[PDB]
């Protein structure tokens, strides 16, 4: 066991070496905290001077001599340069979280702060989306054709609502990390996870047994659009057809609310979710077309 | 507008100063990456030498002379010291996540790595738990006494299942950050969020209208126990009474499955969740009593 003793001697040497490295590490951590305080002060002073200078550009915008007109145009080009460069250093800098991520994960720092790390996280997000849309597809056209029971549709709706919550957490991380994808999309995911829930708690009458087929076909259309929307990371006509299929569902269910003598409250709170999810995404696509135009 | 020009001159000076600080910051980031690679190598070599040395202690454990017996006892005291000290530097060190947090948040680093930051995060977690158990309490005894409708019970069950998922994400962060609270508790939260779901999808017959009252009283007992379990951060007798109330629910619903001529599948998948949640938490408490003893 003397071998263990001499090995211990070697590990004590390595232990004091790692103690040295760990206390150097703690010194570096204190230096990092100091520079984070300094950069936060820099954020404050930079944004203060930004609002002051755009106020100066605002009240200087009124008409005067040609020389100050050249000065205003020149300062406009520079102020565009100002926002681009401060967007760069505000991208790398670690940043306070939003509100929803604050409400779920609490006060914790999730900023990668690295270009290649952001790229890798985007690839991971794309891979996760493809995998779970494969599982959902093998369940939409599957549930429609083999198993016609209530319990499997409940399980499928649990999987859809869980999937939508995971996507909204992921996209909150993605927005607080890097590029701004803020717009219709995050509110689209919120209203779509609300839509998942209403279908689940129907009282399983004949009316659910009629609306089930159109809902499952609509899901198949949604899975195919998201799948082809990833292989690209063409798409527009199938997106228009998705909007029109959504309109088909909305009109059919809205007419269905009048047809039966007695209505649940859940056939009429559910149609208007489809209609809001029509006017939102379709018009956003035409805005992207105008962005293309 | 010449004031803006001279201010610009000052901001260009501050801009090159912040460019200097930012490139120093990037140099420090590269140094951090290098020391993280070094400390990961240290992790590998330390754990390798740990398994080798505990193997040496294992096959050296066999009976021999008194001198090596003193050596084995002495090395046992030191190896306990070895695990304590390596637990310390493996606590501060940033660490790879588990599996569930990997499945939800993806590959992202959530290690605070700071004692006071961990303490602050624990206080935030305690505050969040108290606030949402207040909201749930004002809903359990509330739903029971004023509003007897299906939709409000669905909303309350949505709030409970959302609350349980948020707690399991928070405790995953807490375990991957600091102390080991791994045991019955995280699996308890998983089976309890499974329990929330089964109650929600009942077909609203008379039988649900009978089981509702005992479920809501049980929730009130649960909210009071969690509230008193926080004010401490006494508890044992009310915890025993919670277990026995859980047994009351289990026996009543198990007898209820036989009483009615026709049974849904959801009165018999739901009772055994209560029974598993009885044998688990009660026996864990007596283990804590034995830990006290």
Author numbering:
A (entry chain B), B (entry chain A): 5 to 237, 270 to 329
Tell me, in the authors' exact words, what the paper reports.
Despite sequence similarity, no mechanically evoked current was detected for heterologously expressed TMEM120B, a homolog of TMEM120A2. We carried out a comparative structural investigation between TMEM120A and TMEM120B, attempting to uncover their potential difference in mechanosensing property. The CCD is the less conserved region, but the overall structures of CCD between the two proteins are the same. From the structural perspective, there is hardly any hint for the difference between TMEM120A and TMEM120B in sensing mechanical force. We also examined TMEM120B using the same system, and the current mediated by TMEM120B was slightly smaller than that by TMEM120A at the same voltage level. By contrast, no significant difference was detected between cells transfected with TEME120A/B and the empty vector-transfected cells. In this study, the almost identical structures between TMEM120A and TMEM120B, and our electrophysiological characterizations do not support the role of TMEM120A as an MSC.
A recent study identified TMEM120A, also named TACAN, as an MSC that contributes to mechanosensitive currents in nociceptors. TMEM120A/B were originally identified as nuclear membrane localized protein that plays an important role in adipocyte differentiation. The cryo-EM maps of TMEM120A and TMEM120B reveal a shared homo-dimeric assembly, which is about 80 Å in height and 85 Å in width.
